[model samples]
Target: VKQVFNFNAGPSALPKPALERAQKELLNFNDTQMSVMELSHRSQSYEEVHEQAQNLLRELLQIPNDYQILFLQGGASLQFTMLPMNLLTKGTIGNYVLTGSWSEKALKEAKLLGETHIAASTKANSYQSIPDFSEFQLNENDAYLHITSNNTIYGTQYQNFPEINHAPLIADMSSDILSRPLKVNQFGMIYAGAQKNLGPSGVTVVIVKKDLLNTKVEQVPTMLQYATHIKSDSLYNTPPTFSIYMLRNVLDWIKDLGGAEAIAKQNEEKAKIIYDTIDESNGFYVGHAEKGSRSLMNVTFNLRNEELNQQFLAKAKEQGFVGLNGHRSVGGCRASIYNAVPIDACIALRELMIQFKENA
Candidate 1:
């Protein structure tokens, strides 16, 4: 089989070791003579996989005992509505920092539920940078402060998070989760869809402080309340069994690679190669995000001539590069170097960019 270099932003590449492990056990998991996908969620075989995934994640993040880790079916998009539905009371406000499209969607959902406020925003600047946390006027009685830890589309990331004393800090880390060491205790909650860093598209991982699990809103549908999943250990209904099983394999691969700190170092190194290529190109290539605000996960750039972007993408695809086109909202080229994207792939991409520039 030909090895293709993958750079999709979500439903992204997974570690080879994880895929191999899954392949080996695909037909017979735990000697049950059936695929894990066929196992009952209540069966011990599935239960072990479920518990192991949660445990590995907790160990990797060094999560506090008071926090509850949940695996749910809805993607991160659902959290935008569920978060506000559960947390936002009639009089209280949910404050959001608008950094990119995802955060904007979260803010819009909060507006539909109840009162919402923009504590800080960089939308005026085309989402090219993260707003200064110091400039935010956080309300003392606000429900929570929501921020997207990484802007996948715009390729901007928050280098530092604010220390909100009065309100809880909530982050949508869908694109950058488990890529670095984080002080997990500092946040009221952190959520990420599994497709980017974990395993697949069917599950979303949520870690919330136990005290915040109680919904202030009365009569929230059971499925929408965090308490429902918490009480049932994320098994309130049949969970995404196969996705959880694959997530366990991925976590095992991460542990073998020396956990988040090691992964962060590798991610930084991979990002540096692409950014250095862009910088050395002078006027040949232009990067979208400001210097300090650049994302380590996705590198967004465009050629000097916008018309050549399509040709560049076409040549890249011909050369076995996949998902190099930038998002529709942003007309440019993007290389989403997630955890599973090997450094050699980034090196190859840099070489391709240089060759294309020279030929042009």
Candidate 2:
């Protein structure tokens, strides 16, 4: 099989070692003579796998014991509604830092639920930059401030988060979760889909401070309650067993690499190689994101014209570079170098960009 360099946005590449381990354990997980996929969600063996995954994530992210880590489903999209349904009460408004497409969708959901405020928006800049956190004004009517930790679309990220003393900080970290160390206590809630850095698409991880679960919201369906997921340890219903199993393997891979700190160094180096290529290409490479607001996960850029852009993408596809095309919403190129995209792939992309520029 040809080894393709995967750069898809989400449901992206996972570490080879994690996949290998899954292959080795697929047939008989813990001598059960069955794959983790077949294990009952409530069984002792499966429960151990569940607990191990949660523990690894807790320690890996330095999540305090006060935070409940729920492995729920329905992606971050579900959380967009559920989070507000649970916390955005009638009087208090949810303040969002509108960065890109994802945050826009999140804000839309919050608006449907109750009063919503755009504390800051980069839409005037075409979402190429992240608005300064200082520009956000959280008034007395604020319930919580929401921010998307990484904008996968426009390739922008906040280098520093806002410090909100009064309201809880909620982050939609779907694309960059566990790729770097974080102060888990800083945010009231952190949610992500497993597809990016965790494992696969079937699971969404929600880390919420226990106190936030007590938010006075009425008429919230039982399934939408954070407290319900916390009560059952995210096993209120049949959780994503195989995805969680793979999550444990991914955590093992991160742990073996000395956890988030060491992996972050690798992630930064990989991003720097591609961004440096774009930077050094002068006018040949047109970047979407501002230099300071650039995302370390997704590198967004375009060529001098649509003709050159298509030519570059065609060349990228032919050269075993998969998913190099930018999102359809935008007409540029995005290389989503998530955690699993190795340094060698970034180096290869840099070389191609350089060679393409030289030949141009």
Candidate 3:
């Protein structure tokens, strides 16, 4: 089969080396003569694997010693509800910033469960921009402040986090987690679904400050409770064993690539190659993101005409590029240059675009 450069938004491409390593251990894990999926979670071998995955993640993100990392099931969507359930019982006025569909969904979920406040929003711009921090009306008495660090659909990202006086900060970093270096100490809690940059779906990584784990509200389910996952080590029940194994290997690949700082430099170069192509096209290709709000992980843009857009996608697929089509809400093209996306692949896509436009 021909190797294709994949750029899907979610369940996105993973590093080639990690995939090969997983393939070798699928049927026989560590020469144990049994697949990792078949082994019991409580078994000694599986326990060690679980601990290593957590340790590697902490090291990669440089998580403070005060935080507890939990590998739970369900995507970031569940965390949206779980956060309010576990932390919002103290009051009904939790603050949320709406910059994209994910953050909008998070705020709606909070309202359904109880109440929330729109501290700031850039929805009028169709989430193509991030709201200025000065415009945010933070409530000092609110339980916490929630924000989506990266908007996947609109291709906008928060360049800087807000500084609240007292409330804890909760961020949903599902799309851009570990793609670049971040100050993990800034936020009280962070959650990511391991599909975009981390690994496969079915597992979500949550880093909660130890003090916040005891925020247990009244009458919440034990399984949905953050305290339950903390006490039991995210093994409240049978965890996603296969997903955890894949995550372990992917973290290993990141470390081999010289850790987070090295990976960030690589991502910067790949994004620049594609952005430069867009900038040089002169009305032939127009980018949708605002000047400084552009995302390094997802590059969203459009062509001069709708027919030309369709042609570009067709030619791209013919050249062994898959999932380059834009999202349904925004009709154009999006190149999701995630961590696993190599520099050579981005160059190939850029060359294809230039050739198609010139030939037309």
Candidate 4:
């Protein structure tokens, strides 16, 4: 089989070990003579897979006992509305920092429900940088402070999170979750769609502080309410059993690779190779985000001549590189080096970039 380098932004590359393990177990999970997808959510076998995924995530993130992890559907987009629905109540304003498209969407959702305040924003700069923490004009007693930890579309990331004195910090980490070691206690809530770094789609992992579980708002639909999942242990309805099981396998692979710290180092090293190539290319390759704000997961760059961008992508695809085109919203090339994207693949991409530049 020909080696292929995958760089899709979401529903992206999963660890090869997890895929192989799942392939092996697809026919008969746990010797039950049926696939995990065929098992009942209430059955003990499925329960084990569910519990293992949660426990492994807790250990990987070093989550505190005061936080509750819930696996739900609807991706991170759903959380955009659900969060404001449950938290922005009684006219309390939800504070937001608009750094990218996703964060802007979250703020918009909050505005529909009630009032919202912009703590800071970099959209005027074409989303090329994260906001300065000092520029944040936040009310100490607002509903909550929301930010996107990493911007998949704009290719920027927060090097350091703000420390709000009184407001709870809620972050959407859909693109960069588990790519590095984070202080779980710093945020009141952290949510990630499990496609990029965790597993496939069909599941969203939400970690909320136990105290915030109490929704002061009334009339939220049962499914939209975090309390519903918490009360039922994420089993309120039929869960995405297959995705959860795959997540367990992926988490196990992370554990075997020495957990988050080691994986973080690997991710850093991989991203550095690609970024260095971009920098060394002089004006041939222009990076999108500023140096300090660049994303380690999605490396966005462009060619010296705008017309050459499509040719470059076509050549890359011919060379077994998939998903090298940037998002439509941002016109350039993007290489999403998630946790499962191996170092060798990144090195290959770096070499390819050099070769392409030399020939051009």
Candidate 5:
């Protein structure tokens, strides 16, 4: 059967090889005596798999030795509350960059635990661009500077991360974590919900500087504490085993495809097709983001009329292009060309857009 391209945004498409391998191994893994799911997390076979996966991830992302990569249970949303609960000192400020809905939600969650500063924001511009770095009035003593590295909703991305002199940089990179290479040393903490570029949902991967571990934050549950996971190697309790396994598989797939740099190039090319279409549309299709801040993962665009927009969505779905609808908060079309989405899929979508415009 021919593969149908997926563009769901999160829990998005998996590499074809990875999915095929998973299907083959679901009932029997590695010619082992038991299915991977039936094996104990502490078993020798599982340990090797786990360690190899961890090493692969570290090598792929070029994670610094000082950073501990913990595969935890909760998604990126949990990191919203967890970061402040552990890092934020009582009555102290945490700097938050409001680029889109995710960061806005993260800021709200942080406010419950400690003081939060909207150090810089682009909400006033309908989240069309990242705020200028100079506009960032970062508190010298804030616990950390938090940002959603890529905004899935508004199609805005941080092309360059801010460099705060005193404060550690923390980012919720849920949507675009492994799509490109990052200087892991710059971030005190970097977290992602393992759905978009990583694997299926249910696991959240956190990479934190070693010094950030052993944080003895008071009055928070053990599970909400980052230190707890750090101390226990992220096996403080039962983990989402299958999700982690799949994430490992995805990382291997990325490695096989020449790692982060290769994946980034593919994503960039895919996004260009859609962006170029919108640019050359002659007002037929309009991009919602500023040129510099446009996301290479989620490409959101729109027609002038609501009826035409609805028609376009319906037609796109009819052509087997699923999840082409935009977030309700931002009424327009969004094509989420995540890491697993091939360049050809983007070309197909762009051609479809042209055909749709001609019909209109």
Candidate 6:
């Protein structure tokens, strides 16, 4: 058997214990004499499973009572379109702070729906930095100020979120949710794709304040509106049953690990192992993001030349490291140490990186 470390960005590694539990329960769930996937979503067993996943998430993130946690589909990409449709009335404006490609995509979707403003943007810096928070300007007609909490592609993250008094603060936290303890109450809404940390690709997790639901634009379809999901408890249609069940399993695993705080401590230690290696390389490697804004989840870096970069990736692959290639949009290497990526794997990558530099 071969042991491999998974570093792919999205649909990344999930906790092993969660996978094992799902395997154990695959054939029959809760004495229903049917697989979890085979059970009716409306049935008592499945409903309990749904509520438990949401409850565990609330506990893990310490989400407030006013926030409605809805398990959704269409990934975070869907939210990009849906957000403006639901929030941007004829007069209200959508404001964005573009930090990377994902943020740009969100803004693009908003522009198609209504008026939008770029509150701030770091594209001139090649998306390597977080926009200066102090300079953000919100219009009198602003519905919400949107930002991507973590830039998965660019390997940058906000050290602290801005506190907006003029409008609701919405964040696309697809890549870094649950990786650390967040001031969840600070944001009016937080949305993420479950693949990165929560569970798998089929589900998206949305946490929105209840009062914001009233602002839904009338033209938005029932399904696209956040109020519909909140009122129906995300069971408006056939939910992603298996993905939600698996999400509960992962949440249970996180609980056993002493909740988000403990997991965050481990994340810090794991990310440091890689960041320290890159920092000590002393020109052998060049990190993409600046020091203050570096992402704890994705460590992106590059060697001195094209030849060296290829050789380095090849050596990493040979050492059972996977997904070390940077995104095609950028030429470099990235190590996505998501929540489920263990510390041992980071240590191994650090060792190989050091050895490769010495040999070069």
Q: What does candidate 4's lDDT look like per residue over 1-360, in tens digits?
A: 887999999989999999999999899999999999999999999999899999998999999999889999999999999998888877588999999899988988898998899999998989999988999988855889999999999899999888876889999999998888889999999999999989999999999997887454468888999988887899999999999999999999999999999998898899999999998998889998999999989999899776889889998999999888999987899999999998899998988899999999
Minimum summed lDDT over a 10-residue window in model 4 is located at 210-219
- lDDT of each residue in 243-322, candidate 1, tens digit only: 99988999999999999999999999999999999999976888889998999999998886778998999999999999
Q: What TM-score would every model get versus the actual structure?
A: 0.98, 0.98, 0.97, 0.98, 0.97, 0.98
Off by over 4 Å in 3: 1-3
Candidate 2 regions exceeding 4 Å error are: 1-3, 214-217
Q: What lDDT is reached at residue 159 by model 2?
A: 84
Relative to the true structure, how large is the alpha-carbon lDDT of every model?
A: 0.92, 0.90, 0.88, 0.91, 0.87, 0.91
**Best-fitting candidate, measured by lDDT?**
1
Candidate 6: give the clashing pairs. Answer: none
Q: For model 4, what is the error of residue 317's alpha carbon versus the real structure, in angstroms, after optimal superposition?
A: 0.8
Candidate 4: deviation at residue 243, Å? 0.5
Clash count, candidate 6? 0
Error of 1 at 154 (Å): 0.4
Candidate 2: 10-residue stretch with minimal lDDT: 214-223
lDDT string, candidate 2, 1-360, tens digits? 865788988899989999999999899999999999998998999999999999999999999999989999999999999988998888989999999999999999999988999999999889989887778877788889999999988899988788888889999999999889999989999999899878899899999998889444568888888888888889888898999999999999999999999989999999989988988888899889999999999899999899999999999898899888998999889999988898898988888899999998
Which pairs of residues have clashing backbones in candidate 1? Answer: none
Task: Residues 107-198, candidate 3: write the lDDT tens digits.
Answer: 98898776699999998878889998999888767888999998888788888888865888899999989987888878989999999999
Q: What is the lDDT, from 0 to 100, of the residue 48 in candidate 1?
A: 92
lDDT of 6 by residue, 236-285 (tens): 99999999999999999999998888988898999899989999999999
